[model samples]
Target: SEAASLSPKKVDCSIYKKYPVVAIPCPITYLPVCGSDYITYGNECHLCTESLKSNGRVQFLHDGSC
Candidate 1:
């Protein structure tokens, strides 16, 4: 499976300090994924956290870049 080949990239929440603060709703890992807003995130956890900061406007677009 393509997902099997994808690995979770280690991310530091501190790196997002420049961005808004959104609590990560879930801790599940889904890496190398793309967001509907055209941003490639380290994982779903990263996206979810970011989405909250954006007022739940961002979402998963695919398993890769846009």
Candidate 2:
């Protein structure tokens, strides 16, 4: 149950305002989770019943060059 127990620290997105892309460090050791390294853009992280119905799911994932 590595994936289930895996705790990925969410790095703030506001840190990189001028950069086209940014790297968010996760405290869960090296990457390669669920066959992938790190989360990418368009990946949904949070959900709100009202928002999902109106603005759709919120994607907190961001693609980083590493």
Candidate 3:
């Protein structure tokens, strides 16, 4: 089975200044784990936004719910 791909909006780092947020890098491990902070495909971190299309706003957790 193939895993579903993500199409999150690309966000620039500068946009996060308005809100107090933090971005952390995903740690390398044998099992792939989504980090607490948002993970951008381009390797950039942005604050989680209210809009569903915003960067870092969408993630697949361990339980399989979006």
Candidate 4:
């Protein structure tokens, strides 16, 4: 059977700053997460951290690079 395509969840990174909460650092793991802007993140946590820095402009694409 053919498998269905899967997409990653979108999160607004600015929300972290907006609510004034501390983000826990992620471990040095290499699970990749692709961003909508065509950037590969070290993982979902890192992607979120970058998004927060970019003021929620960046968005997650998928689990791997395009």
**Best-fitting candidate, measured by lDDT?**
4
Q: Where in model 3 is the C-alpha error above 4 Å?
A: 1-11, 23-42, 46-66
For 1-66, candidate 1 gives per-residue lDDT tens digits of 146555334234444444556434444665676766778887766876775577445665567766
Sort all candidates by TM-score, best to worst: 4, 1, 2, 3
- Write the residue-wise lDDT of candidate 2 on 1-66 in tens digits: 256555444333333322333233324333321212332332221112212333323322223422
Candidate 3 TM-score, C-alpha based: 0.18
Enumerate clash totals for all models, in the order shown: 0, 0, 0, 0
Instruction: For model 2, name the residue pairs that clash.
Output: none
- Per-model TM values vs. the true structure: 0.52, 0.21, 0.18, 0.61
Please, what are the lDDT tens digits per residue for candidate 3 over residues 5-50?
5433333434543444443432243233232233323222312232
Better of 1 and 4 by lDDT: 4
Q: Which model is ahead, 1 or 4, in terms of TM-score? A: 4
Candidates' lDDT values, in order?
0.60, 0.29, 0.33, 0.66
TM-score pick, better of 1 and 3: 1
Cα error of candidate 2 at position 15, Å: 1.4
Best by TM-score: 4
- Pitting candidate 3 against candidate 4, the one with the higher lDDT is 4
Tell me the tens digit of each residue's lDDT in model 4 across 9-61.
Answer: 58545444443324646657888878867789887777887776675566787
